[PDB]
């Protein structure tokens, strides 16, 4: 008999786990418990801070919510107006010395006229081809060229996506992009070229909110805090080392054993196969493919430069910098960096030179957060990547050579992106149902490995819906039909459902 | 204060309401009650019997289930193996002296060769058009022609559907037919013609089950019996006469008032609007179109004739009979008609003449169930429709002139089919959200008026899902996404969910 | 017995008749003779002159030759280098205040951007339709819209062609435009728009040559002069009044009768039918359609204005002027108008004012030649057309209100354009075979009525090939296969053939 | 000074050369002369006879005339109605034990039904592809598959054309086949399959006429006989051994020298180059490809078998016989073989064995003419080809094993077919202009090497038109525009033209 017995055990306290925990707590029927090897919940949606006081998320994290349930839990966790800052979704592509507003193809009027000719000719070919197309594209690359034409594909989406996924576009599937037909909007693109028009895809109704304090990690600390503490085990005491699927028993690192009836596992599924000592499953999970994420943070002295402005996140297809995305993290919250009165010496200049004195000077400060991908097809020299990033900041005119850097941050995250390879679905259909038949719900960004439902809201809801399937026989819609949940407003499920209203009478 | 108060009131004890009640009963959370004006549950899924002992459903009723929950409840209600009979899904189209196996287009090799040429030529046009098509069809009629070509369309789907819907095919929408591309399988059709194939689309795979006793109606009597009797109110005592939406009160025939927090109404939504005395809603519901259904039943003396055989249901596009569909109802169960030793006189011969004797003679007996549609665009003379049907049976060679008729049956059902008109959705998206804002879930064949989710299993699950929305925040998939639920096996929701397992432990 | 007898008689000494005569003269086999009612040869390729010394062709006459034979005869007739002036084929379309270089669609960057957007959208539509086209266009109008798209059609080719043909574009055939597929060059059009580029379809190798003296009329006087004078009969003495097909006898106005074995008739085929007193042919030829041509000339004082420059001919789609084409005839040769020392009084200003002084002043002078069409669907007020043309010159900014007009010219030509109506070929293929059966070769712009082989070189060769068919059994390729002769340089037939070389030896 | 001087010299007295002779003789202008190394005119359109009295053409020779001029000369040469026999153009394809009427694809209803399905499926693919096609086929093979689909292509046109051309379909061009669109008549082909119908492409108005005596060779002997004898030189005395193009001198084998002004050469152009000792032209003409033709004749005892009947010529796609075509030559004329009264011994039985009796016996007799091709890509065993042919006749059921063979014939013609390779035109446009520059008109089947104008009538007119170009400046239409002359009735040029009529007056 194990030390502890619950109906439903949840492994992991990132968004997916916390989602399961929240729904279990709401339903208040089956017994449950949640464990995590980290003392601080949040997983990949956590936040670090440098010794100089600059915060960094695990890369650019912008919330877009497809679900009212997710909203409910965030509102409950951070109920005050001044718990949040609201920003428009402002983004650009760096290309040929220019900041080109998203969406890229609608804004190529910024490029030289000869580039415009190349871009439109390419898209004309794609339009005429789309007119007689009667097959869906098989790879990501085919999708891109059918959607954009050669010229435009080559300027942005092809080289950008290699820098992101650390595999060639030709190696990825394309179903994960949705059911929209791969064909260009020739008229829209040429109309903006003729008119000499730029138009970004944001405005007063395209916004996001970001926590006032603690970065993205502040959300999940606050959400976890609404759970009954005696049902959590966070830290070394909550680290899973063994999963005996046949016994329905989990062993923690300190020797604690937990018997369960149903298992919701949100750790990476390759890690779960190892913890299960299941050589068949280990074999299968090793066929999955993922990339690692290097997060680089740069803290900079000065009031925000005009060239930077209200920019939120930025894309970099070109090979004059190693990162694929930059985030002006200091724009998200004034508390992502020190106040202007805080004194800090200059660590280095952007040109790499190490400055005159050790004099601590005042602010204000601003902050850049960068992401570089790594995989077996794309190695990264960890010793030089910080310096290479900083030079990239100078090449892209984000920093002047003389800009003063007062803090740096670098951290490698092993599992960063679950890759939509051609082989992904074939491998998953061999893994997830096998786990299912042992009463294991493996779910999450790496729990079920599907990037298209891999955001904080998706993840949270994969946990919520797993519980709902376990308890109420609900359909796991986010897991099995990403196009369905991404194409609608999911308003039906709330943090207070009729069941709780009726019961409280 | 009302005579009775419940959390959830269900109006109607046809399949939809019984679905709602079964789910309420399983959850055993909020209090509830179900009412019906009829002492016998079942609605349009009920069964009548003639004084001579011939059973008739409300037209041809064949169950194809898309849901495990539905199967669960049927198994619970009729658990013995000999509660059911299994049959292959055998259907034909009557065309030009021929019984043509479904699907019609795959079996036109039974038609004269000159007409096969016309058909194939037409379908060749349709295939060539579909290759360059860049729009969806807008009407039922365009869908038919794109799928079949002109010639095949003119032989079956066009004239048949007018005889069913009692509106032209040009006046209906086609979204209700699902998302498959409107395009011909030219190779399948020509292959069968060239090979002279007459192959029906049924086998050991394609089966249905039918109750051993009581007709389709026996299913719903059995399901209803699993409900706690004291929470039911069936008969004149259960007739709703008034719905006060603003006070959330219902008033019955005898004067009983019932307060509710949430209402699930499965009566026809135009009757609901009148019962609400809501003038705006009355106006909107009068804009919905529907056809009435006449059910004619004929009991015949004799062992099953060879020409009839294992036939189950039959379509009639042609002009020599008033019915659109016939069912060999005596094939569905040997208890649908009297035993061989039962003695009955002959009422008439099929050509209308008087029998040589009025004495009672023994059987065996077989039985025919027919359907005739009625609408404002298509009157039906009640006084002659029985005789016209019987003449139809001679014209179609289902009966010889000499066949002895020992029982007849006719009944008119006012609300028969909810019509998928072009206007339907425009009207419905104004009705249902208004009822929704008053905590009224109007659901069912005429509760929500959508034929594509209008079968017994669909209806039952509309009730089930309305309750799941009310109590557990579930998405109403069957109501809002017909294509979704019809295109998959719906296995997650069971009559025993985790919720009940965990509680009983 | 008649007054004269020849093997081959040619009626008419325009380009077609002179072609017949040159070939007969070269062959020097059968006896022949040519007649015309005008003392001066040349027909519609003749030239008039005002009392003030301004020459005018019958509207814009620019030579492009498809034949080395035609070249030989022109070179023979005007053998000196200073008999000719060479120019680039410079043309523009007047549209919304602008002179738009031909071809129009390649130069719409000069229009407002909003209008460019509509043009390009229309041509995108046309390109996509062209990609799946499987039928030929049936009308001139369909051909135009399939080539340009709606927007560009409406700006130029639709309204311009009504002003030319004096019939709607929907009433004309399009086979006459040749075998090229009706499809747009979308890339060419969008490329020039994107580059803000203008580009005419002329250059150092896209030229024409014009006669130094006497205008186009000089060519045919010179050609005629190479014939044996006693085989010609020009003037009132050469006017044909009657043609007796059955006796093969022509009667002239002074009563002279001519016997022939074969007849080459280049008069308008509807005049020929009347001359034949053939009521059937009269009926048939009356079914043909043609428009009349008003030629208006304006002599202007002053050196060539900068705004005019090297412009040769000009198209006018718009409703602010009555002419469809303008020619800067003073650019074709310095001898088309008086020398600068010549003194002329000013007749009126361009705005209609009297001049300040009626004294004769010197030049230099320049000169504009205009064309206005007339038909039963488009009447022309003969009394006001000159003043209307001059007002039109101000509206289009060719003349300033102050410009001094010193000479005017107006002549109406009954048969100007033979119209490629839908009915043309149906009619012609009854007329020409009946004439052929009578040994009558009816050939020429109105002799055989096909505009696509209606230029000077075509006409000339129609007469040559008619002779060659009569004598040597040659195919009449220009007559029957316009696309053939227009699509190649016809080099085989020369003014000196092998027959004449071997003969002299 | 040479031994003889003429204006025009004609080398060769096959149909091309004789065409040039006949036209020069008609024109009666320049002096001329025609030479041939054979005493008997006709070239590849001549006829051999066996010692047993069986005639054989050089393979199947059936005349279809595109030209009135050709008809005139044939009529002149053989003016009596008993000089000719008329037959319907009856042909079949031998396929899977059956004689299938031409055209093959309209008659596949004769094949097994499963095979018909495969044929129709293939042609459906081809129809759907043709509907969106916007490129022209580049190879013979590509053309075939687009016209017929894969199934039908593999049954006949692909294997047949390899047996004919002795090169793969993938290595030949397809322009030579005309301008018709490469697309299937799906409706026609499926209609005949559905109706179970066969239909040949012959009847009362689809006939050919054949000479009563002397085989096809009798035409050209007779046509030659109408020429002035003194202007001809046929035999060893007329064999050309040297051409000196710079001297315009030809030397014959007996050392006679002829000077010319213009040369019409109808010998194979690769032989012409050698005779010119022009190393450059030799190099180029060696780039042309051609196949050799083996003619085999078999004379058979007995009246014409029922299985043979009215069959004229036959196609053999399959591997069980080496020949690609067979002609029932005894059907073309009763005088193509001995009369019944003629006594001949049996040489062998069709199974290859010795006859029972060696005694001469009577007829009647019939006769089969076979064609086998050969090239560097398809070698033929010359030593066994007769026996292999006769076994092929047994394999195809044209001959019974017991049939008695009374005469055999075999002859190899080195230059049999000028092959339409992909390279043909690139080479010819290097050859023909270079010869033209030297006043050499190289014309005819191997004179100018274009199979699409390589029949007797084409050849004859290539000679006629070359002369017409030389003397009257005519366009060489047959040479340069095969589609033009083949797509019309060429009626303008007659054996008596206007020139001769007017001269006789």
PDB file of N, CA and C in Angstrom, chain D residues 331-370:
ATOM      1  N   UNK D 331      -6.524  -8.114-102.937  1.00  0.00           N
ATOM      2  CA  UNK D 331      -7.783  -7.363-102.951  1.00  0.00           C
ATOM      3  C   UNK D 331      -7.689  -6.042-103.714  1.00  0.00           C
ATOM      4  N   UNK D 332      -6.482  -5.563-103.983  1.00  0.00           N
ATOM      5  CA  UNK D 332      -6.363  -4.237-104.589  1.00  0.00           C
ATOM      6  C   UNK D 332      -6.606  -4.295-106.088  1.00  0.00           C
ATOM      7  N   UNK D 333      -6.306  -5.450-106.687  1.00  0.00           N
ATOM      8  CA  UNK D 333      -6.500  -5.689-108.115  1.00  0.00           C
ATOM      9  C   UNK D 333      -6.375  -7.173-108.437  1.00  0.00           C
ATOM     10  N   UNK D 334      -7.233  -7.684-109.333  1.00  0.00           N
ATOM     11  CA  UNK D 334      -7.154  -9.081-109.775  1.00  0.00           C
ATOM     12  C   UNK D 334      -5.855  -9.383-110.517  1.00  0.00           C
ATOM     13  N   UNK D 335      -5.218  -8.345-111.059  1.00  0.00           N
ATOM     14  CA  UNK D 335      -3.983  -8.533-111.816  1.00  0.00           C
ATOM     15  C   UNK D 335      -2.712  -8.392-110.979  1.00  0.00           C
ATOM     16  N   UNK D 336      -2.850  -8.345-109.655  1.00  0.00           N
ATOM     17  CA  UNK D 336      -1.686  -8.320-108.762  1.00  0.00           C
ATOM     18  C   UNK D 336      -1.083  -9.717-108.536  1.00  0.00           C
ATOM     19  N   UNK D 337      -1.698 -10.728-109.136  1.00  0.00           N
ATOM     20  CA  UNK D 337      -1.310 -12.124-108.955  1.00  0.00           C
ATOM     21  C   UNK D 337      -1.815 -12.932-110.160  1.00  0.00           C
ATOM     22  N   UNK D 338      -1.325 -14.165-110.338  1.00  0.00           N
ATOM     23  CA  UNK D 338      -1.727 -14.955-111.515  1.00  0.00           C
ATOM     24  C   UNK D 338      -3.214 -15.287-111.551  1.00  0.00           C
ATOM     25  N   UNK D 339      -3.736 -15.540-112.747  1.00  0.00           N
ATOM     26  CA  UNK D 339      -5.095 -16.038-112.882  1.00  0.00           C
ATOM     27  C   UNK D 339      -5.191 -17.454-112.333  1.00  0.00           C
ATOM     28  N   UNK D 340      -6.406 -17.871-111.996  1.00  0.00           N
ATOM     29  CA  UNK D 340      -6.641 -19.197-111.441  1.00  0.00           C
ATOM     30  C   UNK D 340      -6.068 -20.312-112.307  1.00  0.00           C
ATOM     31  N   UNK D 341      -6.086 -20.128-113.626  1.00  0.00           N
ATOM     32  CA  UNK D 341      -5.661 -21.191-114.537  1.00  0.00           C
ATOM     33  C   UNK D 341      -4.148 -21.435-114.488  1.00  0.00           C
ATOM     34  N   UNK D 342      -3.394 -20.458-113.987  1.00  0.00           N
ATOM     35  CA  UNK D 342      -1.943 -20.587-113.859  1.00  0.00           C
ATOM     36  C   UNK D 342      -1.542 -21.743-112.940  1.00  0.00           C
ATOM     37  N   UNK D 343      -0.640 -22.589-113.429  1.00  0.00           N
ATOM     38  CA  UNK D 343      -0.159 -23.735-112.664  1.00  0.00           C
ATOM     39  C   UNK D 343       1.170 -23.438-111.967  1.00  0.00           C
ATOM     40  N   UNK D 344       1.207 -23.681-110.661  1.00  0.00           N
ATOM     41  CA  UNK D 344       2.381 -23.431-109.836  1.00  0.00           C
ATOM     42  C   UNK D 344       2.500 -24.522-108.783  1.00  0.00           C
ATOM     43  N   UNK D 345       3.732 -24.968-108.503  1.00  0.00           N
ATOM     44  CA  UNK D 345       3.927 -25.954-107.437  1.00  0.00           C
ATOM     45  C   UNK D 345       3.957 -25.292-106.056  1.00  0.00           C
ATOM     46  N   UNK D 346       3.642 -26.048-105.012  1.00  0.00           N
ATOM     47  CA  UNK D 346       3.753 -25.530-103.658  1.00  0.00           C
ATOM     48  C   UNK D 346       5.205 -25.526-103.209  1.00  0.00           C
ATOM     49  N   UNK D 347       5.671 -24.375-102.742  1.00  0.00           N
ATOM     50  CA  UNK D 347       7.023 -24.207-102.216  1.00  0.00           C
ATOM     51  C   UNK D 347       7.129 -24.684-100.772  1.00  0.00           C
ATOM     52  N   UNK D 348       6.117 -24.363 -99.973  1.00  0.00           N
ATOM     53  CA  UNK D 348       6.052 -24.781 -98.573  1.00  0.00           C
ATOM     54  C   UNK D 348       4.637 -24.599 -98.028  1.00  0.00           C
ATOM     55  N   UNK D 349       4.352 -25.252 -96.905  1.00  0.00           N
ATOM     56  CA  UNK D 349       3.151 -24.961 -96.140  1.00  0.00           C
ATOM     57  C   UNK D 349       3.475 -23.823 -95.181  1.00  0.00           C
ATOM     58  N   UNK D 350       2.446 -23.134 -94.702  1.00  0.00           N
ATOM     59  CA  UNK D 350       2.654 -22.002 -93.810  1.00  0.00           C
ATOM     60  C   UNK D 350       3.322 -22.415 -92.498  1.00  0.00           C
ATOM     61  N   UNK D 351       3.218 -23.680 -92.104  1.00  0.00           N
ATOM     62  CA  UNK D 351       3.905 -24.105 -90.881  1.00  0.00           C
ATOM     63  C   UNK D 351       5.387 -24.392 -91.129  1.00  0.00           C
ATOM     64  N   UNK D 352       5.857 -24.135 -92.347  1.00  0.00           N
ATOM     65  CA  UNK D 352       7.261 -24.326 -92.674  1.00  0.00           C
ATOM     66  C   UNK D 352       7.664 -25.681 -93.238  1.00  0.00           C
ATOM     67  N   UNK D 353       6.742 -26.638 -93.275  1.00  0.00           N
ATOM     68  CA  UNK D 353       7.075 -27.977 -93.770  1.00  0.00           C
ATOM     69  C   UNK D 353       7.002 -28.085 -95.297  1.00  0.00           C
ATOM     70  N   UNK D 354       7.645 -29.120 -95.832  1.00  0.00           N
ATOM     71  CA  UNK D 354       7.578 -29.448 -97.256  1.00  0.00           C
ATOM     72  C   UNK D 354       6.164 -29.887 -97.641  1.00  0.00           C
ATOM     73  N   UNK D 355       5.755 -29.589 -98.880  1.00  0.00           N
ATOM     74  CA  UNK D 355       4.452 -30.025 -99.391  1.00  0.00           C
ATOM     75  C   UNK D 355       4.355 -31.532 -99.645  1.00  0.00           C
ATOM     76  N   UNK D 356       3.136 -32.066 -99.564  1.00  0.00           N
ATOM     77  CA  UNK D 356       2.852 -33.452 -99.929  1.00  0.00           C
ATOM     78  C   UNK D 356       3.214 -33.727-101.388  1.00  0.00           C
ATOM     79  N   UNK D 357       2.749 -32.862-102.288  1.00  0.00           N
ATOM     80  CA  UNK D 357       3.080 -32.988-103.709  1.00  0.00           C
ATOM     81  C   UNK D 357       3.948 -31.830-104.191  1.00  0.00           C
ATOM     82  N   UNK D 358       4.905 -32.125-105.066  1.00  0.00           N
ATOM     83  CA  UNK D 358       5.704 -31.071-105.684  1.00  0.00           C
ATOM     84  C   UNK D 358       5.144 -30.705-107.063  1.00  0.00           C
ATOM     85  N   UNK D 359       4.006 -31.300-107.401  1.00  0.00           N
ATOM     86  CA  UNK D 359       3.386 -31.098-108.702  1.00  0.00           C
ATOM     87  C   UNK D 359       2.759 -29.714-108.823  1.00  0.00           C
ATOM     88  N   UNK D 360       2.942 -29.095-109.980  1.00  0.00           N
ATOM     89  CA  UNK D 360       2.285 -27.846-110.286  1.00  0.00           C
ATOM     90  C   UNK D 360       0.766 -28.060-110.307  1.00  0.00           C
ATOM     91  N   UNK D 361       0.040 -27.208-109.586  1.00  0.00           N
ATOM     92  CA  UNK D 361      -1.420 -27.263-109.519  1.00  0.00           C
ATOM     93  C   UNK D 361      -1.993 -25.886-109.825  1.00  0.00           C
ATOM     94  N   UNK D 362      -3.301 -25.805-110.038  1.00  0.00           N
ATOM     95  CA  UNK D 362      -3.933 -24.537-110.398  1.00  0.00           C
ATOM     96  C   UNK D 362      -4.265 -23.676-109.181  1.00  0.00           C
ATOM     97  N   UNK D 363      -4.758 -22.470-109.457  1.00  0.00           N
ATOM     98  CA  UNK D 363      -5.215 -21.542-108.436  1.00  0.00           C
ATOM     99  C   UNK D 363      -6.653 -21.784-108.011  1.00  0.00           C
ATOM    100  N   UNK D 364      -7.398 -20.718-107.646  1.00  0.00           N
ATOM    101  CA  UNK D 364      -7.038 -19.291-107.617  1.00  0.00           C
ATOM    102  C   UNK D 364      -5.965 -18.983-106.598  1.00  0.00           C
ATOM    103  N   UNK D 365      -5.493 -17.736-106.586  1.00  0.00           N
ATOM    104  CA  UNK D 365      -4.434 -17.322-105.680  1.00  0.00           C
ATOM    105  C   UNK D 365      -4.802 -16.029-104.979  1.00  0.00           C
ATOM    106  N   UNK D 366      -4.362 -15.879-103.734  1.00  0.00           N
ATOM    107  CA  UNK D 366      -4.391 -14.576-103.075  1.00  0.00           C
ATOM    108  C   UNK D 366      -2.992 -14.270-102.543  1.00  0.00           C
ATOM    109  N   UNK D 367      -2.830 -13.098-101.939  1.00  0.00           N
ATOM    110  CA  UNK D 367      -1.508 -12.525-101.729  1.00  0.00           C
ATOM    111  C   UNK D 367      -1.449 -11.532-100.560  1.00  0.00           C
ATOM    112  N   UNK D 368      -0.454 -11.712 -99.692  1.00  0.00           N
ATOM    113  CA  UNK D 368      -0.210 -10.857 -98.528  1.00  0.00           C
ATOM    114  C   UNK D 368       1.120 -10.080 -98.661  1.00  0.00           C
ATOM    115  N   UNK D 369       1.095  -8.775 -98.409  1.00  0.00           N
ATOM    116  CA  UNK D 369       2.301  -7.948 -98.448  1.00  0.00           C
ATOM    117  C   UNK D 369       2.606  -7.414 -97.047  1.00  0.00           C
ATOM    118  N   UNK D 370       3.823  -7.663 -96.574  1.00  0.00           N
ATOM    119  CA  UNK D 370       4.221  -7.335 -95.201  1.00  0.00           C
ATOM    120  C   UNK D 370       5.355  -6.314 -95.134  1.00  0.00           C
TER     121      UNK D 370
END
